[PDB]
Structure 1
């Protein structure tokens, strides 16, 4: 009665926490596949020995060579592993839009896709949705996990609004002028999600992720700043009732629920402790200073390949910021500049190649924007 789990991005934060959840629950879960990029071979070798899984994908050819005997190696390794491994659940914890092909392959096998890699859904859009049956994608992202639990509070016709909470990042309350001086070390889960959290681009991706997972119109997806990150998101129903999910921050909770959906996993995470005092605070997002969420809505409403453009433009601008080439406020400046030139990408993708064409265009246009700074 064990679920067979493929873990993509096994050596990262989410991947190792997932392996820990699986280790703690041998009656429910069994690891049958691992994929990693090759930057952390030490961790990967330990994972092979501990799980006893030799069914492994390594993206970097040289790193795979150095290990020896890796059955899937090279840029398509993770995808081929998914295509050729019998599984009940695929956990996609890869980072970036490179998770796109493994997401599509996972869905095509019929397995539950436990999705941490929000970018593959954001980029893929209707192409990823067409590949999925209803409920096949189960969110690992903490907010979306919370939304899915809260939606149990009523029927679909009773949903008024979905309320996505945001930490606000380290620069919550900072002025536009304050942001000009943000260093990479200040804006630094992995380096991409840490940065995306600080810039609010993560929240923008999550608005798009919300629309795609739950089919709710953009004008019914609210974002509220909640610095404590105890409330992970909420749903407001048509009678005025709001149902919210709360827990001390710990990704093992949403990971555990996504792997075993619909069944909750005993002891996954610590519960809220109401025997000590606390406060849960809410404030509006300053959209003038942090316009990334609004840009995401604009990209989402345009639809088609525009969400792929939004993400791809961020990936390049973020890389440039982390390399010390542009200032912090330039990240979202570049995204806006790219999106506003992106007329032709409103068309719905027919194939993966359409998405890849949009991203290719977006990366080039982002470089052009960087070149002008």
Structure 2
């Protein structure tokens, strides 16, 4: 039958790709709602015009002054749309803190939650897990998608290891000496139309993989000591699962986010023709190498934060966002990003308590930001 989809974060990379998948498959999906932040209001209104979907939300009341016929506008417009719209799937592709409440509201409706928003698990942690029922959250990220597919190779009891693949970023194989010279431009700072300035940087620092390890733990309930990372520069294998008998199951495809997006939307049913398959008519090789954790300790720190628990992973992420933004502005050097994450984490044990409310989480991030700010300025 046809799945009713609410698209939250409709004007971003994931949201617009999802809308293409939906447009290509009207047999499988219909859009029933759209939510955006306000900065790309003209895109959202063009989406209303094209899809015929009048059920739209704009978070920015000031931006909403421009339109006059938005049913939901202002702070928590996306949450109210989720609360009041009948749907089968909520795609949460909102960015940052504003994704958290809509995740919670979506879980409450009982819909499937196709999750792209990182803050929901990384910051929200136990608030989100306590609210979610088994299998309700389907991840959109290609690594987590790969894991969800490979886990079909046995029972939960048969799992020995989850193995996440990492590109290695631009500085794969570089020494600690090399990393001292890293400029913002080298670490992927360009005014790219597509993605956030932090996405390329987090991949270079290995914080992205740290964040993915944390999400892997919460999604699949596997201990941090059984979650491994391997470097794989080709990015064809998106992740693997090792089972108790010694067998490893891996998922492979040429990079294309429409594959994991389509599957997240249609879960558990695959969507015919979503992506190109691996072609074996031409020679290739898939390479693996250990991550140098002495030079790139960002994953080890993510495990330390995750094992600590509570609001510690929110601290890790908020410390990163401040330090990484500081590097991009020329206030610190590249090695200091993860250096500062560590120093803030090591002073953050008051935050190991479990959050009771969204505000608890917001309080931890606030503390982490200003702690990171002090470490940057030397104050």
Relative to the length of structure 2, the TM-score reads 0.95
Residue 244 of structure 1: how far off its partner (Å): 0.2
Give the secondary-structure state (helix, strand or coil) at the position aligned to 2:130. helix
Residue 60 of structure 1: how far off its partner (Å): 2.6
| Structure 1 pair 126–328 and aligned structure 2 pair: CA distance change class (3 A) | same
| Structure 1 pair 318–37 and aligned structure 2 pair: CA distance change class (3 A) | farther
Give the whole-Å Cα distance in 2 for the aligned partners of 1:159 and 1:146.
15
CA deviations 1:103-137 (Å, max 9, x no partner) are 11111111111011122111111110000000000
Residue 50 of structure 1: how far off its partner (Å): 1.4
Give the secondary-structure state (helix, strand or coil) at the position aligned to 1:66. coil
Residue 141 of structure 1: how far off its partner (Å): 0.7
CA deviations 1:39-84 (Å, max 9, x no partner) are 2233222211111112222223332222442222233222222222
Aligned twin of 2:291 = 285
In 2, are the aligned partners of 1:126 and 1:304 still within 8 Å (CA)?
yes
CA deviations 1:3-39 (Å, max 9, x no partner) are 1111111111111110000000111111111112222
Give the whole-Å Cα distance in 2 for the aligned partners of 1:204 and 1:101.
23
In 2, are the aligned partners of 1:98 and 1:120 still within 8 Å (CA)?
no
Give the whole-Å Cα distance in 2 for the aligned partners of 1:181 and 1:118.
30
| Structure 1 pair 327–157 and aligned structure 2 pair: CA distance change class (3 A) | same
CA deviations 1:309-361 (Å, max 9, x no partner) are 11111122222223333222222122111111101111111222221221121
Give the whole-Å Cα distance in 2 for the aligned partners of 1:299 and 1:315.
15
In 2, are the aligned partners of 1:119 and 1:205 still within 8 Å (CA)?
no
Greater mean alpha carbon deviation, residues 233-242 or residues 119-128? 119-128
Give the whole-Å Cα distance in 1 for the aligned partners of 2:46 and 2:270.
28
Residue 177 of structure 1: how far off its partner (Å): 2.4
Give the whole-Å Cα distance in 2 for the aligned partners of 1:225 and 1:40.
36
Give the whole-Å Cα distance in 2 for the aligned partners of 1:328 and 1:74.
38
Greater mean alpha carbon deviation, residues 7-16 or residues 191-200? 191-200
| Structure 1 pair 318–266 and aligned structure 2 pair: CA distance change class (3 A) | same
In the alignment, structure 2 segments of 5+ residues that lack a partner are 189-194
Aligned twin of 2:344 = 338
Residue 262 of structure 1: how far off its partner (Å): 0.3
Give the whole-Å Cα distance in 1 for the aligned partners of 2:317 and 2:94.
15
Greater mean alpha carbon deviation, residues 309-318 or residues 130-139? 309-318
Give the whole-Å Cα distance in 2 for the aligned partners of 1:184 and 1:57.
35
CA deviations 1:183-238 (Å, max 9, x no partner) are 32322243222221111111000000000000000000000000000000000001
Greater mean alpha carbon deviation, residues 78-87 or residues 28-37? 78-87
In the alignment, structure 1 segments of 5+ residues that lack a partner are none
Aligned twin of 1:205 = 211
Greater mean alpha carbon deviation, residues 84-93 or residues 37-46? 37-46
CA deviations 1:234-286 (Å, max 9, x no partner) are 00001110000000000000000011100000000000001111110001111
Where does 1:93-172 land on structure 2 (aligned, <5 Å)? 93-172=93-172
Greater mean alpha carbon deviation, residues 38-47 or residues 261-270? 38-47
| Structure 1 pair 125–64 and aligned structure 2 pair: CA distance change class (3 A) | same
